């Protein structure tokens, strides 16, 4: 048994070894050259009015002006953005939820939490109405964030410390996914959706095959959960949102952080991470109730969103990167541009 | 200025909106109750007589309840506690007997209630305490003493010291009493003791409100 | 998805009748209700809407005041109650189903229709073509024109293609002149541009009998007078 351990822990310095060797330089000093962003001063464009609890996920449609949001009140909404009309309100059979998806193809929408269930709506019935598509069980633990691969497939993640690939035609984990020893809180599809990277409560970040169900890499130094994590446009970076009231960009290839961003009165955790259709973006949603515009290339507090009175729970950049949406326990979205 | 199909469309969010306000008016006027406690600390009989989280819905003397069991949740419970930060109130529950038991569990039942009384979320929370069992009490302190979980304990073992003693020892772990009460009860008695406790709850948060508590 | 009108039959001049559509296998509340009419051998023409609450509703100027639409949401039931009947109400009425926010398709489902027989501004869309020789396997082209330009500032291009088989209801084809119905092969493509719209039925095979209305959902509805195509 010791044995085991003895050589667990020579791998792990043999790897924290490896890491080294290839931390020849910074990012920081590499992006020394380049121009700063300008202040990135942003405008609540639109106000989205109609949630009466906290809002606790956001999700774009791909056509970057439907949005599906969550909240505690036990609804579903679809926002026209462009209007702000309400397309459709979903009401949930557990109003405990605390993540939503949108599919790619519009079809259908995804929503879990307390209930440890993703339950898939569909959006194009014959009827008219929206209604439970499927309900998929398997996980032991809350739900905390799905995404959809396609109209067939989702992966989700859970409080159980495993996340789970679906068909949805048959309700079966196609694939289950462990080596998390906490929570995993927060799930990002690469473009390609060939992988996907997950943050836990273990403070670590593990980046997975969807197809082989292996676990490619893990990604450690955020000194407490890691609440929100989202790819990098390229595919090959990631960044994670943790409670030590950091963000960490980490690269794929270089397999180790490249940069964190953090100031000094900066305290609180932060609740949701997204980039910029271009990347040079990172913006966070902290319990401080605003967000912070991140240089992601420079590290510096480009522009503050503030225009909630709650913590931002979640936020998201659209497809053709036009609009932010930040949703907020105070029960409001706002589209900023 | 909005064409034929876009008027309809707001006309459509229009309804949405009023189906929303009206769900909300009917929540609102509805008791939400956290139910808590260790593993086998007899909520089972609290539910009774009344995979994930189980929801329970009653309605008592004209109010609406809506109970929520999480004890099933063996993950964090820092993760997702802040989702009850509205409830009215919670029923902490801790079987009496658990004195001279092992997972020591009296022990765990007082850290879980410390930590959650305690907690940020539920500074202005009130608590309702079951201290269930209390018939199994009664028999086993005639025969292992409350001592044996409370060494600084001296009062004679008998059931009415004994369990006194227990609810002093759960309601010193309030760090709040100015802002935050604790209902406690041993144990149709209990669910009438979670009608008072709540509407006791509900009057003085609306004269805080009005100004007159 | 049914619907089923009834209250036909033959009427004397100047009298009153109400028909009355049975909705069922639908959401009925969650959508708006239209009445359309064709005379017995003439085009469609657009009656009364009614809309999801009943919130608005809307007439024909032709019936304005004598045809009253209502609604019964717990029943699934629409109506139309008529009065002071003239020669021109002499008509199979159907009934259509319209869902309306970001997206939809309205106008997708129609009724069988009841046929009733009386004893005895405006946008225009032109259909000139009004008829056309038809080969299985071809491609042919249905054009449309109308007074005012279609396209809204908004973007939408508000133009409908039905088809009406012989002996049956109008079905959508394409709604909002390029968004193709559900149930709808490929084949169908629409194109417009400067108030001109064309339907293009390339490689075109059975099931493609009958005559082809255009309908424009800008303001209020108005249809074209309908293209034959026959083999």
């Known amino acids: 048994l010791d044995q085991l351990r003895q050589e667990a822990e020579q791998l792990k310095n043999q790897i924290r070894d490896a890491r080294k060797a290839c931390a020849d330089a910074t990012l920081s000093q590499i992006t020394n050259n380049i121009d700063p962003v300008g202040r990135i001063q942003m405008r609540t464009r639109r106000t989205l009015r109609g949630h009466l609890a906290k809002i606790y996920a956001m999700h774009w449609g791909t056509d970057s002006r439907l949005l599906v949001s969550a909240s505690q009140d036990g609804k579903l909404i679809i926002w026209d953005s462009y209007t702000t009309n309400k397309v459709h309100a979903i009401p949930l059979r557990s109003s405990w939820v605390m993540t939503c998806a949108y599919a790619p193809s519009g079809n259908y929408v995804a929503c879990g939490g307390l209930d440890n269930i993703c339950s898939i709506y569909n959006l194009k019935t014959r009827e008219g109405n929206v209604r439970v598509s499927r309900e998929l069980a398997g996980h032991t633990g809350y739900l905390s964030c799905c995404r959809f691969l396609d109209d067939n497939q989702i992966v989700t993640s859970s409080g159980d410390t495993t996340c789970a690939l679906w068909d949805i035609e048959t309700g079966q984990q196609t694939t289950t996914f462990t080596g998390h020893t906490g929570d995993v809180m927060s799930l990002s599809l690469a473009p390609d959706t060939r992988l996907f990277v997950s943050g836990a409560c273990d403070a670590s970040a593990k980046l997975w095959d969807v197809r082989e169900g292996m676990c490619r890499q893990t990604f450690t130094g955020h000194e407490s959960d890691i609440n929100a994590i989202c790819f990098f446009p390229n595919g090959n970076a990631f960044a994670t949102g943790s409670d030590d009231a950091t963000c960490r960009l980490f690269d794929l290839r270089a397999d180790q952080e490249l940069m964190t961003y953090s100031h000094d009165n900066i305290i609180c955790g932060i609740t949701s991470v997204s980039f910029s259709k271009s990347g040079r973006l990172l913006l966070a949603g902290y319990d401080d109730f605003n967000c912070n515009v991140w240089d992601a290339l420079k590290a510096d507090r480009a522009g503050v969103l503030a225009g909630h009175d709650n913590r931002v729970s979640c936020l998201g950049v659209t497809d053709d990167g036009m609009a932010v949406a930040t949703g907020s326990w105070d029960s409001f979205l706002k589209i900023w541009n | 200025t909005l064409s034929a199909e876009d008027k309809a469309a707001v006309e459509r969010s229009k309804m949405i909106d009023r189906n929303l306000r009206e769900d909300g008016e009917k929540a609102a006027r509805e008791v939400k109750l956290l139910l808590l406690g260790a593993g086998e600390s007899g909520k089972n009989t609290i539910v009774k007589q009344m995979t994930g989280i189980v929801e329970t819905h009653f309605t008592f003397k004209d109010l609406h309840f809506k109970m929520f069991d999480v004890g099933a949740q063996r993950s964090e419970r820092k993760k997702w506690i802040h989702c009850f930060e509205g409830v009215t109130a919670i029923i902490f529950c801790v079987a009496l007997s658990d004195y001279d038991l092992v997972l020591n569990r009296m022990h765990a039942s007082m850290k879980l209630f410390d930590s959650i009384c305690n907690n940020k979320w539920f500074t202005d929370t009130s608590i309702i305490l079951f201290l269930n069992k209390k018939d199994l009490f009664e028999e086993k302190i005639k025969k292992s003493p409350l001592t044996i979980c409370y060494p600084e304990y001296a009062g004679s073992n008998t059931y009415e010291e004994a369990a006194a003693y227990i609810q002093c020892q759960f309601e010193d772990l309030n760090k709040r009493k100015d802002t935050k009460e604790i209902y406690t009860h041993f144990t149709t008695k209990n669910v009438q003791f979670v009608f008072d406790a709540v509407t006791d709850v509900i009057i003085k948060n609306n004269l805080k409100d009005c100004g007159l508590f | 998805v049914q619907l089923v009108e009834s209250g036909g039959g033959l009427v004397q001049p100047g009298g009153s009748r109400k028909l009355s559509c049975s909705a069922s296998?639908?959401?009925?509340?969650?959508?708006?209700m239209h009445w359309v009419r064709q005379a017995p051998e003439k085009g469609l023409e657009w009656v009364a809407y009614?809309?999801?609450?009943?919130?608005?509703?809307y007439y024909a100027d032709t019936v304005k005041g004598r045809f009253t639409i209502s609604r019964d949401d717990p029943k699934n039931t629409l109506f139309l109650q008529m009065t002071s009947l003239r020669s021109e109400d002499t008509a199979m009425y159907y009934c259509?189903?319209?869902?309306?926010?970001?997206?939809?398709?309205?106008?997708?489902?129609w009724g069988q229709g009841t046929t009733l027989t009386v004893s005895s501004s405006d946008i225009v869309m032109t259909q000139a073509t009004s008829s056309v020789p038809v080969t299985p396997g071809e491609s042919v082209s249905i054009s449309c024109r109308s007074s005012?330009?279609?396209?809204?500032?908004?973007?939408?291009?508000?133009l409908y293609w039905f088809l009406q088989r012989p002996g049956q209801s109008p079905q959508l084809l394409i709604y909002?002149?390029?968004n193709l119905a559900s149930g709808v092969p490929d084949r169908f493509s629409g194109s417009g541009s400067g108030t001109a719209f064309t339907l293009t039925i390339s490689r075109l095979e059975a099931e493609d009998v009958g005559v082809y209305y255009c309908?424009?959902?800008?303001?209020?509805?108005?249809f074209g007078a309908g293209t034959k195509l026959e083999l």
């Open positions: 009614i809309s999801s609450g009943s919130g608005t509703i």
């Open positions: 005012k330009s279609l396209l809204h500032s908004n973007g939408n291009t508000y």
């Open positions: 296998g639908f959401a009925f509340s969650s959508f708006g």
């Open positions: 309908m424009q959902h800008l303001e209020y509805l108005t």
């Open positions: 909002r002149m390029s």
């Open positions: 259509v189903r319209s869902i309306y926010y970001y997206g939809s398709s309205p106008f997708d489902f």
